[PDB]
């Protein structure tokens, strides 16, 4: 029923508004038209640490930036976890499956929502008070210099689809309820829910983007690009964790950012 | 107009039959035990392999080079099919070559699923059947060659696509505007968008109770890309450790990254 699909869409939208403080609408306002403090080079970074109250700085710069990304990532996990619970049927799932879905889903969602905070020039940080430039991020040591660059490449393509929060809310739900995650015990109710969400996304896009032919298909294809980015991120993150990170980190901190 | 999309589906299915001698329909009739087709000789060990080599036509290398010869033939078929996709031959030639370069492997493993069950794979135009176990037991490098293809095939075959569906899906894959080094993405994307429309409708008409088959089919792209990457990096091993082994020019040129 159309009405029920529209109902699901509104429920998801409202839940997303509650779960995610910095929405695409808000991000887009900051980027185009207070105003963000820009970090373009070394001197601006250090000044940025004075002006902005970073929560991650624990008395090299490349590591400090990376830890900042880790801090935010861990915050995002909790926002996503809360959003998941609002999705009709999620909480009724086997508890191991819930964990499994979030375990493998959060990375894809992080980069989807990061795209909201990005343009081709840089990324909003610290609740949109900051803006770290893309160029500045590129010009870091060989490990960390290629960290965020494939996220920007993804974001530029993704943002060209010009989705809104109401679209993204349904898209994110679809990602979470993916029946193909390893270790799942009961795929039936997972795919039944995703079916329902996919139907709602379809209608949402048709109503919200009537001129954009096969936006649905295009959005589904981007999910493939997300999984590609995530596999590439993870393998890079193994080098980092093993090589340079666990050398400079406190044991407890390693536990928090164990991933 | 959905009538235009049906005509397109008809066109593509027709070109697929003409381009690909061994369809899924034929493959299934062989694998099931249907009387439209005949039974295959089964290779499950060194002995059967050797006996099979008599009837049908280092063991691990000889198998590998046979599979590579078949990949060459597949590339030829896929190239012929691509030319039939409306708009394709009108693209910049460099783009044509780039689309085939990255497209063929995703297609090869897609259509290889048609020849597979959980137990093994048809070979030599359906005359043979090589077991999964046998393939998995080969010398260390060549052992985990085919395993990921089977794992993909098991899940991909769960969709229960027929050839008509595959024809359009294969077309979608070729016309990917996200391939590295494309000169004109917009013309490619416009073709793919019409193909996607045609696929959508095809799956709704042909599989009317299979809910969100369209969305599920597109999600299988992830699995496809993974197979490719594993295969590529497996071939690098063979190049370093087996400097005696030749590689067909067509395949070299595809693998060139």
Tally Cβ neighbours within 10 Å of residue B187: 17
Q: How many inter-chain contacts (A to B, CB under 8 Å) are there? A: 41
Are B225 and A224 a contacting pair at CB < 8 A? Answer: yes
Q: How, if at all, do strands A130-133 and B120-123 pair?
A: unpaired
Residue A52: DSSP 8-state: S
Burial of A252 (0-12, 13-18, 19+ CB in 10 A): exposed
Query: Which residue, B95, B111, B110, B100, is CA-closest to B75?
Result: B100
| Structure's resolution in angstroms | 2.2
Quote the radius of gyration of chain B (alpha carbons, Å): 19
Q: How many CA atoms lie within 13 A of A139 on its CB side?
A: 10
Q: In chain B, which among 64-103 make CB contacts under 8 A with chain A?
A: none
Q: How many CA atoms lie within 13 A of A26 on its CB side?
A: 11
A214 is in an annotated binding site: no
Residue A94: DSSP 8-state: -
Q: In chain A, which among 27-46 make CB contacts under 8 A with chain B?
A: none
Domains of chain B: 1-257 (1.10.565.10)
Are A221 and B221 a contacting pair at CB < 8 A? Answer: yes
CB B222 within 8 A of CB A224: yes
A107 is in an annotated binding site: yes
Question: Which residue of A178, A195, A214 is in closest CB contact with B196?
Answer: A214
Experimental technique used to determine this entry: X-ray
Q: How, if at all, do strands B41-43 and B128-131 pair?
A: parallel
CA distance B150 to B121: 9
| C-alpha distances in Å from residue A61, one per residue of A42, A66, A142, A234, A243 | 9, 9, 13, 22, 16
H/E element holding B116?
strand B116-117
CA distance B242 to B150: 25
> Between B185-206 and B163-174, two packed helices, what is the crossing angle to 10 degrees?
160
CA distance A10 to B33: 52
- 3-state DSSP assignment of residue A118: strand
């Amino acid at each position: 029923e159309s009405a029920d699909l529209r109902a699901l869409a509104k429920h998801l939208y409202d839940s997303y508004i509650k779960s995610f403080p910095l929405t695409k609408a808000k991000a887009r306002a900051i980027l185009t038209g207070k105003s963000p403090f820009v970090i373009y080079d070394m001197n601006s970074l250090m000044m940025g640490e004075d002006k902005i109250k970073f929560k991650h700085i624990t008395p090299e710069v490349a590591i400090r930036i990376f830890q900042g990304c880790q801090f935010r990532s861990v915050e995002a996990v909790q926002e996503i976890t809360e959003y998941a619970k609002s999705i009709p049927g999620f909480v009724n799932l086997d508890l191991n499956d819930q964990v499994t879905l979030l375990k493998y889903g959060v990375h894809e969602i992080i980069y989807t929502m990061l795209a909201s905070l990005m343009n081709k020039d840089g990324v909003l940080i610290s609740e949109g008070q900051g803006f770290m430039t893309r160029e500045f991020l590129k010009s870091l040591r060989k490990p960390f210099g290629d960290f965020m660059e494939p996220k920007f490449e993804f974001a530029v393509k993704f943002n060209a689809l010009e989705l809104d929060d109401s679209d993204l809310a349904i898209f994110i739900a679809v990602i979470i309820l993916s029946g193909d995650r390893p270790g799942l015990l009961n795929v039936k109710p997972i795919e039944d829910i995703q079916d329902n969400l996919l139907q709602a996304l379809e209608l949402q896009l048709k109503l919200n983007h009537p001129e954009s032919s096969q936006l649905f298909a295009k959005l589904l294809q981007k999910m493939t690009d997300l999984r590609q980015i995530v596999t590439e991120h993870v393998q890079l993150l193994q080098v980092i964790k093993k090589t340079e990170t666990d050398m400079s980190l406190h044991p407890l901190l390693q536990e928090i950012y164990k991933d």
